[PDB]
Subunit: 159 residues, 8 copies
């Protein structure tokens, strides 16, 4: 029941993208929390969140943000837990700024980065699931089923 | 002694970059294997490697490749294990082709991507360590100490010569 | 009657783009098959398809995909046949990721790459036609006519 | 002895890159000619070359050029034969201008484009070989052997020094 | 009455952009011709056009095209006249491919390149006008008036 | 003697670039401090530095960092003082990642960004000087003289060898 | 009452973006002027404006422009005052041309550059406010309140 | 002897590139002047230069600058004469900033832009020559001969070593 994955995003505007991560975790029945935490507007909120994540029982953190996206990297700076980053598509630069701001972390503080947008949010949840599956047999089986259904469901010819 | 992390790369030319992942895992005392698997030249070798990774005891796979870097993504297509990708810097496009070819995986098949080059290789190892630390108290303690030392080792001022 | 060109695409979403390749081949009366094969979701389907392509009588394979587009390159990895790649326009990066993921193949495993989008799908079919024309006199004549009509049909002044 | 593949390039500076296409065709025993044809300096030479390629016995044309690389596209405008383009790396833009100038052909006039640089040149030759192999059993056998050897020659592990 | 400026474009699709060049020349009463000439679809038409331009009395050629835009460069290859190029905005790459394909001409065969899109078409006409003005006093005065009105008409505060 | 400008950078490797900001402030006689503060390795050090900057007497902060350059933006998140950012050139992406990571701050938390590299560092110092000059007549006079000399020192023609 | 901040933009088309800077300054009760000044169409207007800015009592200048954006840099060339630049999003290149044309100023003539678009306009006003706050206690308090409200108003969870 | 073309550049560092424009004009016997005019450091010098260019007898202006290259555009803002711009290659961004800062002029104020670097400088001179040739028969003959020689001088095949 207690969350094992924390999904945080820079603002309400990121929800359209991050809701895909939320839906996936719920689909795989992975207990999680979904919050808004701004690296630039609520720095102390982020510090406290990242710093106490492990103590609170979180295993993986999924962070999404756009533009000069500092949320994933700064979160990783305060926690020992694996942090996965989702570059949210920005208006002007289409998420290229989001992507470079997240993926280019210097050696020492990693952020597992996923694709720009919805695909990335969905994959961050799946990646978090694959991480949890390493020590949760029941979940591992549900993930196997999920991947199996995905593969088996691809049509053979276009409509 | 059995490896829990597998480091694979597209060619010997990728070693200059991937050796940093190898070195870090060894530093943290994480058993691992290091191999060359080409997505374009040895597709069947990749299929077999990725398909059997879980049953062989591997927990995480770190794949590095450059240019049209398909190695990480295709590995993830065959394994349920988390796959971390390292974009190896390319000559002309400076790893931008490597980066986009790895990070832009479509929804459904993830690849946790790190930075272009040596930093990405080192971080792939560190990310893998943080994953394993979730269920290995001893490793978790070593990682905590490693991160703590890194933070404490940062100088307060530059050597202004 | 048996297909000599195989058109494969990563998903139904690519059809809007790849249908142009299908239409061109049909226009030139080139027997072909149109299928959905995902490099990331159906890897074994792709392996089997590419591996057996030549045995099945295929001469050229046209593969289209977007984003981290691995379909053309992986197809080429399993077949000796010429593989032509169509970068499908992606939402965020407008097919630049698709393009680099396809065209930058390392020496040893080629993929003849065409333009991003519909133009590319249409040109992959035309390129496949020009390849088949080298050993099919009837088709060669139909291709000559097609190219001739294209050239002669260009207006001299804008409307 | 008659050439079946024609390799053309915009200038002597392109040879460093295009020589890889020449070497590969020779390796596979594919008769070919190698010439310099400038789309911007010798437009009429290009027109004549492309227009008469088919009647001269050529089956495939490999064109390499950099910067505002118009050579491949204009060659394709005049010939019905398949034209493969090699983006030669440029100084400032690292071949990105070369690549876009070649690959972005509008619908109706194709240019099968390969990677920027030496890899693209080698692959243009290999692609040309795979095309010719469709109607040349002997060549098809040589190509099959070549691809098979490439796959079998990939090392299993990196020389970790 | 005889045209002194030739406006050529790769296709009808470029008209939306090139019509701005046409309108400007008409505004400044500069005799010109507006035609469709495709470098890739009508290469011989282009060769003939560029080759005979000077003989026909043309002084400047304005060429617009998008994507792998070869029209301006190839036109310049066949004529000694100044050739100005307009990169037409492409669907996927927004004219970046158009721009690089036009502006990066190697030393020896120049193409005076203008901005991507409508602004570029309008400026190619103005640049052509400034060229003709060097030897046409009447036109030079009309151009001075045009530039003067532009400057004087800029509002001092936004509405 | 009390510093009114604080120059911070992510690592010793940034000094080669940031030393230009240091040199210029000293030239204009602007008291300042120069420190290394890592946004990713010493997040708490950054929080404390930025939070207390105003009370410590600082008026402007110049922050330089490369790659995933979060230092300027995070500093601005904690201080009400104007923060100027210098994108340090990165190896692979030539500072483009540095630039976008700094300049693209969302509405509400500004970072006045300068050019990539040494020019940006020098301009960050000059911008800081122009800010301080608004309420420091003596400095305003020195800056005016500096700008005037720069303009008067530009040669009229190139040394055509 | 006399303006202490001058907001200038290249054209009426930039207003949609620069109005955000105007609104912010008004919100913080910072006296300012909002004008249209084109570096390319009204160069002498710009020269006069920038040259006399300090004499007129201005403390900071916020300049916004798109495309080949020369307004901020040229303004800085004529004034000793701090000049902040706002890259306006362009149609084709989405403000990347605007951004590079503004931020890449050579050492010697600075321009404090903000993000592309509305965010940048809003931040230029806030940056100008933070500059004025250094010597205006009342304003400094209003800025503290503004930043405090921003931080406190961020929701904890998405809707 | 009076100059009909004016070549201006932002700094001595631009000469390495702009000297190619100077050399070509001299080759074609086109009288010209070469000066350094900084758009950012000597704005008034630029205003005066551009404003008086026509009355001084100049017919074409070739302006070269890099980075935030405002020189060509601002020159065009003050003169009715055609202005040709040469994007000087920049260190970090390889002239991309130079190119966009010059070519993207808004409708109403044109700058005929050439390629990044030496090729652009040479072509700016050639473009200027083609403009002047429209009303100078002697020059038109020299240009025709120059273009003809260029075309005739292209080798037919590469020196395959």
């Amino acid at each position: 029941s207690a969350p094992v994955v924390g999904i945080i995003m820079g603002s309400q505007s990121d929800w359209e993208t991050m809701r895909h991560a939320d839906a996936l975790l719920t689909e795989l029945e992975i207990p999680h929390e979904t919050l808004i935490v701004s690296a630039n507007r609520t720095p102390d909120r982020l510090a406290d969140y990242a710093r106490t994540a492990a103590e609170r029982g979180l295993n993986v953190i999924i962070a999404g943000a756009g533009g000069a996206a500092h949320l994933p990297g700064m979160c990783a700076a305060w926690t020992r837990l694996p942090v996965l980053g989702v570059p949210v598509e920005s208006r002007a630069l289409k998420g290229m700024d989001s992507l470079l701001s997240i993926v280019q972390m210097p050696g020492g503080v990693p952020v597992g980065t996923l694709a720009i947008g919805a695909s990335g949010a969905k994959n961050a949840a799946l990646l978090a699931a694959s991480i949890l599956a390493l020590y949760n047999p029941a979940l591992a089986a549900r993930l196997e089923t999920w991947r199996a259904l995905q593969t088996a469901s691809v049509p053979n010819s276009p409509i």
